[PDB]
Short mmCIF file of C-alpha atoms and ligand atoms in Angstrom, two decimals:
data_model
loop_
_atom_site.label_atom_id
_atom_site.label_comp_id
_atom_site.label_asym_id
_atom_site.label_seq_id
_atom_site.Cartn_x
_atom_site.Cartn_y
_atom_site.Cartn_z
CA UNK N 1 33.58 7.10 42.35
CA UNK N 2 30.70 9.50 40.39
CA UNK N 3 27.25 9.57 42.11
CA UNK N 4 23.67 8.47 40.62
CA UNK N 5 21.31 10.48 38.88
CA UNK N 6 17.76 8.90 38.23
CA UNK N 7 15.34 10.75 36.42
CA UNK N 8 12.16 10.41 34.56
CA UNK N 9 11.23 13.46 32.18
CA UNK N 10 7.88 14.59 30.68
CA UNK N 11 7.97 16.99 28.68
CA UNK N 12 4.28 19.47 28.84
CA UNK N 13 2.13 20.99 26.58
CA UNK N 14 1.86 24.52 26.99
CA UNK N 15 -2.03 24.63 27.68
CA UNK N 16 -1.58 22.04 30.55
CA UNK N 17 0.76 23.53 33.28
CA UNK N 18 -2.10 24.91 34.92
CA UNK N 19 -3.89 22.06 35.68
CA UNK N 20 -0.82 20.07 36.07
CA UNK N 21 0.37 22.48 39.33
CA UNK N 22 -3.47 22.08 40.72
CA UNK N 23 -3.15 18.30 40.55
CA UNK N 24 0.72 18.16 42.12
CA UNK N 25 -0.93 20.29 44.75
CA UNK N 26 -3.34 17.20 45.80
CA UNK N 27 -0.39 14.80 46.45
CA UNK N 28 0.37 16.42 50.15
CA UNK N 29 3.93 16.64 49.41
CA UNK N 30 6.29 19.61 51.01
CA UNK N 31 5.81 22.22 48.64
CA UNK N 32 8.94 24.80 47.31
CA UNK N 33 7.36 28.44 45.43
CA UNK N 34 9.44 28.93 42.00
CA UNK N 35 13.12 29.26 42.40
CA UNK N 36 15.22 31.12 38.80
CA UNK N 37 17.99 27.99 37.77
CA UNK N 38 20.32 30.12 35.91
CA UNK N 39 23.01 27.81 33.95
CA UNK N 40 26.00 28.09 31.30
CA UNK N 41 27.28 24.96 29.56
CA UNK N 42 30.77 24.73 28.67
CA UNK N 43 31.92 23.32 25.65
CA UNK N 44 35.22 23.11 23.19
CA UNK N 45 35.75 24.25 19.58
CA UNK N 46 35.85 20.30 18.31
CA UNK N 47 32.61 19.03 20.52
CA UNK N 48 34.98 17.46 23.10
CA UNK N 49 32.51 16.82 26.38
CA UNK N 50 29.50 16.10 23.29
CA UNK N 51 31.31 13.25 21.91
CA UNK N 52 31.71 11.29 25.21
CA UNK N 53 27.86 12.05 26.20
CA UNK N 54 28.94 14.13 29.13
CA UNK N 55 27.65 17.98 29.96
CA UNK N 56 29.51 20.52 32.27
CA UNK N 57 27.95 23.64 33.61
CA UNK N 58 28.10 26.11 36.65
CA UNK N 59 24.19 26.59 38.12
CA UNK N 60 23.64 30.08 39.91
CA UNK N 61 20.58 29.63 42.56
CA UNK N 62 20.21 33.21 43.80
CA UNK N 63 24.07 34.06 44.20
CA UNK N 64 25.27 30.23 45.22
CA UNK N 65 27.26 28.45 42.79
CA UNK N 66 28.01 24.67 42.05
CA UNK N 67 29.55 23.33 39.22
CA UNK N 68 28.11 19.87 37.59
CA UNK N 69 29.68 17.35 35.36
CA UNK N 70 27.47 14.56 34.08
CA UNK N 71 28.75 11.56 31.46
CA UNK N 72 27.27 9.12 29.32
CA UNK N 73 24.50 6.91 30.82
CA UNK N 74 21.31 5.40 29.77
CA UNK N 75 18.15 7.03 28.57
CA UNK N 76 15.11 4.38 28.12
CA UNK N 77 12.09 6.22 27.24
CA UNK N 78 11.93 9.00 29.85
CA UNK N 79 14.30 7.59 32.16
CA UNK N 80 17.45 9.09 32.57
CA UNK N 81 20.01 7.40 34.21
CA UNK N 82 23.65 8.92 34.45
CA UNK N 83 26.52 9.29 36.76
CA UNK N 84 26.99 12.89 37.85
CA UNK N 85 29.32 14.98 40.39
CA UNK N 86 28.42 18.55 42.02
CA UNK N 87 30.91 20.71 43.80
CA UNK N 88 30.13 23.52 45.41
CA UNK N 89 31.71 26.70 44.12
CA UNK N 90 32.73 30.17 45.64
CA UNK N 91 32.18 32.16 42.64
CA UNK N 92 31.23 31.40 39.00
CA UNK N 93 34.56 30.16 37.79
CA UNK N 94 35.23 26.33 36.80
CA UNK N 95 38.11 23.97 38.74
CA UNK N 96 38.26 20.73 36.96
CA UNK N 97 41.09 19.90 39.60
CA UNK N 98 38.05 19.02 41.99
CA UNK N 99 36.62 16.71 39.88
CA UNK N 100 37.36 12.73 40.49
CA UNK N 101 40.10 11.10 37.64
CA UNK N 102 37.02 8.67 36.67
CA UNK N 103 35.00 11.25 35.27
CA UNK N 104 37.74 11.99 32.63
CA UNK N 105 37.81 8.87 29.74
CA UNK N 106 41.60 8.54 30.18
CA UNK N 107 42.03 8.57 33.91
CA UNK N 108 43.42 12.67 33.58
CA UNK N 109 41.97 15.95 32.74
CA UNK N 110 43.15 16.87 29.47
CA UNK N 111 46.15 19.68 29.38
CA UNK N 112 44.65 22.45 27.64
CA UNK N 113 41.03 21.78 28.45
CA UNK N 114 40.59 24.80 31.35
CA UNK N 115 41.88 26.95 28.54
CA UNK N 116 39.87 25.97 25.23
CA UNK N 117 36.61 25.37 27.00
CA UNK N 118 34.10 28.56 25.80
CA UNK N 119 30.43 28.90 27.19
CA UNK N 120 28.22 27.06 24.17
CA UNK N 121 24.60 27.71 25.84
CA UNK N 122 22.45 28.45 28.85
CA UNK N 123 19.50 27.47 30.41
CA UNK N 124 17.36 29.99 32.23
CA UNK N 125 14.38 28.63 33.95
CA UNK N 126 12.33 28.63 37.31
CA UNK N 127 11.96 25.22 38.90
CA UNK N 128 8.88 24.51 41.40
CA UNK N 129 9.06 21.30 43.79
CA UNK N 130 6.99 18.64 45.34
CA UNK N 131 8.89 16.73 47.91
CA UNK N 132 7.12 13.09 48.02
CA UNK N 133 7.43 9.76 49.72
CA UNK N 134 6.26 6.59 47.34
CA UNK N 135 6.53 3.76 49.50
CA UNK N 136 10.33 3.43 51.11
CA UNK N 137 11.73 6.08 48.16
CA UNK N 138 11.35 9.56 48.21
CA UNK N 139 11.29 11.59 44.87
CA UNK N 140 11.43 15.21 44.17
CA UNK N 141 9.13 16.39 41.38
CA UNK N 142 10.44 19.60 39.36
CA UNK N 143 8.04 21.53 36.99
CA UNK N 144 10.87 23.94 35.14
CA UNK N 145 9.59 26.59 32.68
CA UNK N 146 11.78 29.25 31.08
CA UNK N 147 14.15 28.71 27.86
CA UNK N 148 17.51 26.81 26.46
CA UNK N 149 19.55 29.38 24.45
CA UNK N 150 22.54 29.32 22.22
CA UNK N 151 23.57 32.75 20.67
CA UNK N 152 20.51 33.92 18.62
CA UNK N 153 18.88 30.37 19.10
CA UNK N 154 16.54 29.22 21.47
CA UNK N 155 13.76 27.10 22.23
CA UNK N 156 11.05 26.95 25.01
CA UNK N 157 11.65 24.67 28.19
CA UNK N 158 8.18 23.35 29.95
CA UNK N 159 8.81 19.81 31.47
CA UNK N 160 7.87 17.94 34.31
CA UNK N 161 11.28 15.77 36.33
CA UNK N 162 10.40 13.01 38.85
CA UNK N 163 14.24 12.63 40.49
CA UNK N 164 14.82 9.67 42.63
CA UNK N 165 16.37 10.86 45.46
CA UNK N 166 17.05 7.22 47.33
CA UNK N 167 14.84 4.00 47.35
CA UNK N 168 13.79 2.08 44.23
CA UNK N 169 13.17 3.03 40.47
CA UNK N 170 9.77 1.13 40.80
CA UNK N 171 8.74 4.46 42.99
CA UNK N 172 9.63 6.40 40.28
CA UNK N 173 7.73 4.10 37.57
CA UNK N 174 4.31 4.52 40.01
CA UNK N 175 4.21 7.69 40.95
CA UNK N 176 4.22 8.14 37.10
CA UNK N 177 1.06 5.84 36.52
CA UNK N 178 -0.83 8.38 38.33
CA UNK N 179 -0.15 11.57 36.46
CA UNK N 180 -0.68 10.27 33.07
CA UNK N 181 -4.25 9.66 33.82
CA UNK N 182 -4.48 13.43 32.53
CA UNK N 183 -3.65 14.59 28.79
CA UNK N 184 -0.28 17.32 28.37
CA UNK N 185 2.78 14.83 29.36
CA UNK N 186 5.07 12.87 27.47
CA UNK N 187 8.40 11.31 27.97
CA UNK N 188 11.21 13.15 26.90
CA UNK N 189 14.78 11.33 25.73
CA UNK N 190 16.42 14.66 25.29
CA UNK N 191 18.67 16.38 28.13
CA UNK N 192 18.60 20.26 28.40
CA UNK N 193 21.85 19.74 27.27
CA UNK N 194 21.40 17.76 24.30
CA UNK N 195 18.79 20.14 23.02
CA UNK N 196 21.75 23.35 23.91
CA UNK N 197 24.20 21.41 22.12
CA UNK N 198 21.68 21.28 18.79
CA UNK N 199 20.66 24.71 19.18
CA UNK N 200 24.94 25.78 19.32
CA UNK N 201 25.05 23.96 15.44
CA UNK N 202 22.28 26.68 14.64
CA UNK N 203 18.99 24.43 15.19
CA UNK N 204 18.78 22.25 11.59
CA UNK N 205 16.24 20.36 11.29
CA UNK N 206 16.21 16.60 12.84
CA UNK N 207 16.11 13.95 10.11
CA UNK N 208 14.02 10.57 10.02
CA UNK N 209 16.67 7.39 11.18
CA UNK N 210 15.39 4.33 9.48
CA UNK N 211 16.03 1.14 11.66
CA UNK N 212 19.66 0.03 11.10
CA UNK N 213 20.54 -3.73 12.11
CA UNK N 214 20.84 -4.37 15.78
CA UNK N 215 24.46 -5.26 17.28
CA UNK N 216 24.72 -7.15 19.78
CA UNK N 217 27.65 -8.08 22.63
CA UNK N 218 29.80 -10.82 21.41
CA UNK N 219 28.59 -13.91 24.28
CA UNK N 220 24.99 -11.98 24.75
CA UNK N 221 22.37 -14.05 26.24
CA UNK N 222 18.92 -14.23 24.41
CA UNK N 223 18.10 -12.21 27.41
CA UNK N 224 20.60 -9.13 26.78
CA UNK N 225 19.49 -9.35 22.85
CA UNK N 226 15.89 -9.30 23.82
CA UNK N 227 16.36 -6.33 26.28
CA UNK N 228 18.73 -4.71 23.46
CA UNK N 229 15.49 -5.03 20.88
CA UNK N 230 13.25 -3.42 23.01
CA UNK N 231 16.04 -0.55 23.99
CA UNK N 232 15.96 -0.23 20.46
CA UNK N 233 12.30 0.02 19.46
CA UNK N 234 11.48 2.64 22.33
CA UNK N 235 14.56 4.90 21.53
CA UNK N 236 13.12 4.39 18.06
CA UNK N 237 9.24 5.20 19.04
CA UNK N 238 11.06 8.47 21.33
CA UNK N 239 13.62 9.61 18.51
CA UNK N 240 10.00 9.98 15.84
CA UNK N 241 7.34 10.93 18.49
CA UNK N 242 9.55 14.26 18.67
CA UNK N 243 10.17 14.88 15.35
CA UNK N 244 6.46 14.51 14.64
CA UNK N 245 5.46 16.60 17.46
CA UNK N 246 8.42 19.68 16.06
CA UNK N 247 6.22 19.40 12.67
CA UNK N 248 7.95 16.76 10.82
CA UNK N 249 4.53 14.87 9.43
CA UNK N 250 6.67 12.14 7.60
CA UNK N 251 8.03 11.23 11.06
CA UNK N 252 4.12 9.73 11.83
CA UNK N 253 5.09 6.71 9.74
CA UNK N 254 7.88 6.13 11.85
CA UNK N 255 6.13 5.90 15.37
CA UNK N 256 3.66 3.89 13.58
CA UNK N 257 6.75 1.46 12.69
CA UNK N 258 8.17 1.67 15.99
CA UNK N 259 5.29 0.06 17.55
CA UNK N 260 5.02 -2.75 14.99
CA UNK N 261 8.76 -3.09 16.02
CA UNK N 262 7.82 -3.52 20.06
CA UNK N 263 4.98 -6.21 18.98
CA UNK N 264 6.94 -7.74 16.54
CA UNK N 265 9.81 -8.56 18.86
CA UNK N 266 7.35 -9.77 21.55
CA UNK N 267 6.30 -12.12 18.44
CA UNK N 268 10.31 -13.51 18.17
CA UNK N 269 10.64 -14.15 21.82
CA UNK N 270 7.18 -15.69 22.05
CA UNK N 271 8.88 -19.00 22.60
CA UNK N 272 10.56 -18.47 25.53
CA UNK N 273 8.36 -15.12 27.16
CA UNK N 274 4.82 -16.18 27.15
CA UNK N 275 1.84 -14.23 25.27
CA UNK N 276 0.21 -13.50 29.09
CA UNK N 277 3.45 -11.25 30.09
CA UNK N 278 2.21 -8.97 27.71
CA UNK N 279 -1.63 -8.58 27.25
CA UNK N 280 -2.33 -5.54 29.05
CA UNK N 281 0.78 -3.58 27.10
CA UNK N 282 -0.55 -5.29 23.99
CA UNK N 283 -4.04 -3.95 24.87
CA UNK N 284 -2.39 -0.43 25.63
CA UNK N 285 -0.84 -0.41 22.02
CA UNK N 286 -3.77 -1.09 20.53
CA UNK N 287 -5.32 2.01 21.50
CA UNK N 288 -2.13 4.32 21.38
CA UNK N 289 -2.38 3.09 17.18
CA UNK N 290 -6.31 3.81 16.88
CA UNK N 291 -5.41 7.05 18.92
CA UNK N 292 -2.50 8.09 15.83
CA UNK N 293 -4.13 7.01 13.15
CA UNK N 294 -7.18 8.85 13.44
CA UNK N 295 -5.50 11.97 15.02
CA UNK N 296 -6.03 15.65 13.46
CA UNK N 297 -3.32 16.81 15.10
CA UNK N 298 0.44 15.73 16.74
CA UNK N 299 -0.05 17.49 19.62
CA UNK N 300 -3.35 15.77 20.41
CA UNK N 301 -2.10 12.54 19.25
CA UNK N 302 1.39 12.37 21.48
CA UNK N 303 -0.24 14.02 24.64
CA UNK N 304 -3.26 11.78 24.61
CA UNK N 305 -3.46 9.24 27.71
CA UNK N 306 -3.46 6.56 24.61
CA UNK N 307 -0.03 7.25 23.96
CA UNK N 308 0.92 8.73 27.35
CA UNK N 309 -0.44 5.07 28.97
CA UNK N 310 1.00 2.92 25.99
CA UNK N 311 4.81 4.36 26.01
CA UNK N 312 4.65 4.14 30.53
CA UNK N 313 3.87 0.46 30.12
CA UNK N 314 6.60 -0.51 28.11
CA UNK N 315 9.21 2.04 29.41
CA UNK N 316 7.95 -0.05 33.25
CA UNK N 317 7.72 -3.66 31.50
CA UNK N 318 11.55 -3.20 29.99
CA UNK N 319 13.04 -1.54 33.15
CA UNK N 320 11.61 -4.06 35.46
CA UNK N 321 12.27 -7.07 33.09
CA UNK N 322 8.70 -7.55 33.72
CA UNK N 323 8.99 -11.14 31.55
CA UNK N 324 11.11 -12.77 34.14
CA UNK N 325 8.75 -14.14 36.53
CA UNK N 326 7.03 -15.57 33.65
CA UNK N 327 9.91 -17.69 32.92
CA UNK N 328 9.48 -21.47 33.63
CA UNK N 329 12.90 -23.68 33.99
CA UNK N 330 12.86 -24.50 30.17
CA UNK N 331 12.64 -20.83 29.24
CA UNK N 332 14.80 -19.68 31.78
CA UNK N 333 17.77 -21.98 29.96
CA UNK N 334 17.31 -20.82 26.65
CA UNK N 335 16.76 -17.13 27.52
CA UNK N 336 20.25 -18.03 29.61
CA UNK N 337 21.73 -19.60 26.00
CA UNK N 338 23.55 -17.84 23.00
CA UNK N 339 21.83 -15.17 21.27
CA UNK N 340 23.84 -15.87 18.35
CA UNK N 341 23.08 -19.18 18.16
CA UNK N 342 18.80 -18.40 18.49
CA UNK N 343 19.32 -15.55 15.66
CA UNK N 344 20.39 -18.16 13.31
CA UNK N 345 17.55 -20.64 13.96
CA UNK N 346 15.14 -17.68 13.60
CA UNK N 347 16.84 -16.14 10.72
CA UNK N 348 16.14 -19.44 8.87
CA UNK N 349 12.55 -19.28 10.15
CA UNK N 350 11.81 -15.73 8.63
CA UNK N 351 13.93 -16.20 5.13
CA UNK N 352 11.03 -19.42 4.88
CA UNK N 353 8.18 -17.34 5.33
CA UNK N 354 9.72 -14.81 2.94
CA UNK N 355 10.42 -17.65 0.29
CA UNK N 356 6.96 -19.24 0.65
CA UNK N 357 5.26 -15.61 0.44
CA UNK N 358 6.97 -14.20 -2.64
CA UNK N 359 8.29 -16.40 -4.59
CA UNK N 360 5.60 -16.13 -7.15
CA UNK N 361 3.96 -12.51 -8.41
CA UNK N 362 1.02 -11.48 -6.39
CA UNK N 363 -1.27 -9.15 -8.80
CA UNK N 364 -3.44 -7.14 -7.06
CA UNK N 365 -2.81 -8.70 -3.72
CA UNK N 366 0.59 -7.24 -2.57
CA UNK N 367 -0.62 -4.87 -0.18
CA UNK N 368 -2.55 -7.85 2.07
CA UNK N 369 1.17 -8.92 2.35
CA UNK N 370 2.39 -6.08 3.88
CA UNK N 371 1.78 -6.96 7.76
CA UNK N 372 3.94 -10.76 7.27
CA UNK N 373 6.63 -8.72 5.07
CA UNK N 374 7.23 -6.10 7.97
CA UNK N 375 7.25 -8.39 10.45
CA UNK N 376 10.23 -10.68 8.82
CA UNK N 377 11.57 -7.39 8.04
CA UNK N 378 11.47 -6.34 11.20
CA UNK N 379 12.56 -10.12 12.74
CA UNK N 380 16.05 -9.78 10.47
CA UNK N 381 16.95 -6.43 11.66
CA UNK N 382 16.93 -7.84 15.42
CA UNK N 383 18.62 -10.76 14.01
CA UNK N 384 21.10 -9.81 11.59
CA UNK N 385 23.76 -8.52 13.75
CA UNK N 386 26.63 -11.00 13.96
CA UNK N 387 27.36 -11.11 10.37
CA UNK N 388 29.10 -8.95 7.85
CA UNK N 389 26.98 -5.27 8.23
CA UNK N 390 27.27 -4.69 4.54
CA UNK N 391 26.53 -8.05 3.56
CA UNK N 392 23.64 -8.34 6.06
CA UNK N 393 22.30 -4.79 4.95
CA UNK N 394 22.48 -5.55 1.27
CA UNK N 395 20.39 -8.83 2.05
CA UNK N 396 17.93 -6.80 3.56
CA UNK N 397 17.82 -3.92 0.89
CA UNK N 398 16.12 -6.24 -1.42
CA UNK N 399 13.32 -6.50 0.85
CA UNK N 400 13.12 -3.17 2.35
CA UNK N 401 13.11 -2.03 -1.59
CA UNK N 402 9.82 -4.77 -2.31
CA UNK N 403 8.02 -3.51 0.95
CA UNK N 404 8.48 0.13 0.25
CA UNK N 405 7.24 -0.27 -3.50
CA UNK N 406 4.18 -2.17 -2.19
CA UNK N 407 3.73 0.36 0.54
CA UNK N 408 3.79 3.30 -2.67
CA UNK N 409 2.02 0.55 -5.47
CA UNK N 410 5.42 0.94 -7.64
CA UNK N 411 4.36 -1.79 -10.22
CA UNK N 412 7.68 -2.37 -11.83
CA UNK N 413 9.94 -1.84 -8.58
CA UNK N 414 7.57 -4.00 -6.97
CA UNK N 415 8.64 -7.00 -9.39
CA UNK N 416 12.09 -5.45 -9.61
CA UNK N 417 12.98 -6.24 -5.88
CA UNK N 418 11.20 -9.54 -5.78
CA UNK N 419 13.20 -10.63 -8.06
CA UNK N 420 16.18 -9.48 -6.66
CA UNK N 421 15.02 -11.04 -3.16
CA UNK N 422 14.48 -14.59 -4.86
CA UNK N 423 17.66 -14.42 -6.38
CA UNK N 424 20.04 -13.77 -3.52
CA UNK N 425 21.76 -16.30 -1.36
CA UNK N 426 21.58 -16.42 3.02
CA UNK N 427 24.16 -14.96 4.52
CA UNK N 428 23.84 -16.49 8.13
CA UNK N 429 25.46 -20.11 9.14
MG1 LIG V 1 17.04 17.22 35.06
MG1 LIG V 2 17.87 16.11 38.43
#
């Protein structure tokens, strides 16, 4: 079979590499000087290895060669989480015939795929290391600092790695609680790879993904729906916290809306996971939104120990499923029951608080509304998903529309879309 590969990335601001190497340097770990990782990436005219979420490259560590393939895993927050092989190599030169059949999608390396395969980018960058033992695990920390390059583009590489090497993810998750006690890190959802593959389409500009409906398995739990929702909202809060820090300002909005998406679904499974499994991430929020809102700068704002504490307790309360001990017998049932039989209780629930809310004109006093209209908003999307997408998505248009005008005081499409959202039928059973 493939091996494991468990990861959690930071990325670092510039300013704080200094002090970060002094503080590594305190944790009495076996220490490795700076080593030059020199890498190509390999890549087809149509995207091939991109569309399957899988990166190939040869690495070159002072004259020694090894070729790596790694495919599509799971990146929550930070954490990255993805089956890999390594082979050792005589010289630079790939042989896909070493490679297991289960890394390919259809059980066989495709004919012509040695031939087509051109080198897209590299990555050039020394790595320094910090051997440590966290309880029963032991985890190798790698601060890499150099650049990602594709033809005439590149961009700057300065992140921090904490790489499980064998014991328990929970390691990983607190060794991590004690470095973001300092300002300059912040998780990072993007592979060297994924940011070489961007660069190779000549660098455009990211653009702003508004929250889509969530999909769900067919036969989900409430439990796999709940931990889908919160997958969501922290890709979400990751996906806008790095467009804001690049210099997109409109992406501040976003994070903003991410967070109201993590409490808000805490809100819809308040029936089953009690308000005490979250306080102290609730509390963490909190701060992380004072922290944004009042910020002068991105930079500031996303490095802060707000944010940096805020986004480590949720990425540790999803990937421990820190709700279940919580769980009495009754909520342990229905978090065992149909999620698509709890969406359409609670779909009903939010389409009555809509109905009550603004089914009349408001005046002046729209924009006191805002907080219940995002939340139902936000409630639907999580909801929505077993239905007809275009059905489901036009339902929700109406409201999106009345909350944005609000949101912009839009007098006329403010009335507009209310009126459209009274006059429209449910969609759900
Ligand atoms: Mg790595
Ligand atoms: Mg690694």
């Amino acid at each position: 079979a493939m091996a494991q590969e468990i990861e959690l990335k930071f990325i670092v601001n510039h300013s704080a590499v200094e002090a970060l190497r002094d503080h590594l340097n305190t944790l009495g770990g076996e220490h490795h000087d700076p080593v030059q990782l020199l890498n190509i990436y390999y890549e087809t005219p149509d995207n091939w290895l991109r569309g399957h979420d899988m990166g190939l490259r040869i690495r070159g560590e002072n004259g020694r060669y090894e070729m790596t393939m790694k495919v599509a895993g799971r990146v929550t927050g930070g954490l990255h989480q993805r089956p890999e092989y390594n082979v050792a190599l005589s010289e630079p030169t790939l042989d896909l015939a070493q490679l297991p059949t289960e890394v390919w999608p259809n059980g066989e390396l495709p004919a012509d795929l040695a031939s087509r395969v051109q080198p897209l980018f590299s990555t050039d960058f020394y790595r320094e290391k910090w051997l440590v033992a966290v309880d029963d695990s032991r985890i190798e920390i790698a601060l890499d600092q150099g650049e990602v390059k594709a033809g005439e583009f590149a961009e700057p590489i300065c992140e921090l790695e904490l790489e499980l090497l064998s014991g328990d993810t929970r390691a990983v998750l607190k060794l991590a609680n004690q470095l973001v006690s300092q300002t300059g890190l912040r998780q990072g959802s993007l592979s060297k790879a994924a940011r070489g593959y961007h660069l190779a389409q000549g660098n455009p500009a990211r653009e702003i993904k508004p929250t889509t409906i969530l999909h769900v398995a067919a036969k989900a739990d409430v439990e796999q729906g709940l931990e889908a929702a919160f997958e969501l909202a922290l890709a979400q809060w990751q996906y806008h916290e790095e467009l804001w820090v690049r210099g997109n300002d409109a992406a501040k909005e976003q994070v903003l809306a991410a967070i109201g998406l993590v409490r808000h679904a805490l809100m819809l499974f308040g029936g089953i996971v009690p308000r005490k499994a979250s306080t102290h991430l609730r509390d963490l929020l909190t701060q992380c939104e004072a922290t944004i809102a009042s910020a002068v700068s991105a930079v500031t704002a996303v490095y802060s120990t707000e944010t940096a504490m805020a986004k480590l307790a949720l990425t540790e309360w999803l990937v421990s499923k820190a709700w279940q001990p919580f769980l009495d017998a009754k909520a342990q049932g229905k978090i065992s029951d149909s999620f698509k039989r709890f969406a359409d209780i609670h779909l009903s629930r939010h389409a009555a608080e809509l109905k009550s809310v603004f089914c009349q004109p408001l005046g002046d006093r729209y924009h006191d509304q805002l907080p219940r209209l995002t939340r139902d908003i936000d409630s639907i999307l999580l909801l929505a998903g077993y239905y007809d997408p275009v059905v489901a998505q036009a339902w929700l248009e109406n409201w999106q529309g009345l909350r944005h005008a609000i949101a912009t005081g839009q007098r006329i499409e403010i009335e507009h879309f209310r009126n459209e959202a009274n006059n429209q039928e449910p969609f759900w059973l």
